[PDB]
Design a protein around this ligand. Structure first.
Ligand SMILES: [Ca+2]
Length: 223
């Protein structure tokens, strides 16, 4: 997250870190057994880390649970990033509490202008590199589909939306991928892609979760 703030420990209780020896992507806890992330984050050998603030220090509220299964969306295209969503099942159920909590799925799509919370452990610099230990947060609005398409000609599908600031300076970034965009208490987006980070006229692009609720629910119900 570039241009954001320190969230505070366990203030974003649905945020998870995906770990394969090292943090590599975010995700969102949607029930005791299942995490939502980006398909481009797929790899084997995932350990889900819940209850994290500093990802390099054991602070006392963590739950580390290995994934048993991951399910990339059936129509994910890694070239275009269309349908950049995947589900990860935990080998054992998380113990839900005030600091480890699921986030609700939306019932309707969000609108441009809605303010959302974007979070992660990704790069905090737009020109260099600096990776934080503690969770960072950014409040940002959803942008109009016409502004989004104009920013990224030929690249924005109906399964994507833009959020952020056209002036630059405030965005998600590498290492935030897979993490949440939460608006009014609902998971509306997944950190997906962008041109660099925090660049003028190049807002963040997010997977549009509302399009996937029926796939998420039916997949969980049979897996
Ligand atoms: Ca920790």
């Amino acid at each position: 997250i570039v241009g954001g703030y320190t969230c505070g420990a366990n203030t974003v209780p649905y945020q998870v870190s995906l770990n394969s020896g090292y943090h590599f992507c975010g995700g969102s806890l949607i029930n005791s057994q299942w995490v939502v992330s980006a398909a481009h984050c797929y790899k084997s050998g995932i350990q889900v880390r819940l209850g994290e603030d500093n990802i390099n220090v054991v602070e006392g509220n963590e739950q580390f649970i290995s994934a048993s299964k991951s399910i990339v969306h059936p129509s994910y295209n890694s070239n275009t990033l269309n349908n950049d969503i995947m589900l990860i099942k935990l080998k054992s159920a998380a113990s839900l509490n005030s600091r480890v909590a699921s986030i609700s799925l939306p019932t309707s799509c969000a609108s441009a202008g809605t303010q959302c919370l974007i979070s992660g452990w990704g790069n905090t610099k737009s020109s260099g590199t600096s990776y934080p230990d503690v969770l960072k947060c950014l409040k940002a609005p959803i942008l109009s589909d016409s502004s989004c398409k104009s920013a990224y000609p030929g690249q924005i599908t109906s399964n994507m939306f833009c959020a952020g600031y056209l002036e630059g300076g405030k965005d998600s970034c590498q290492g935030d991928s897979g993490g949440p965009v939460v608006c009014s208490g609902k998971l509306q987006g997944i950190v997906s892609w962008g041109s660099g980070c925090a660049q003028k006229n190049k807002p963040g692009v997010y997977t549009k979760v509302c399009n996937y609720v029926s796939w998420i629910k039916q997949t969980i119900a049979s897996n």
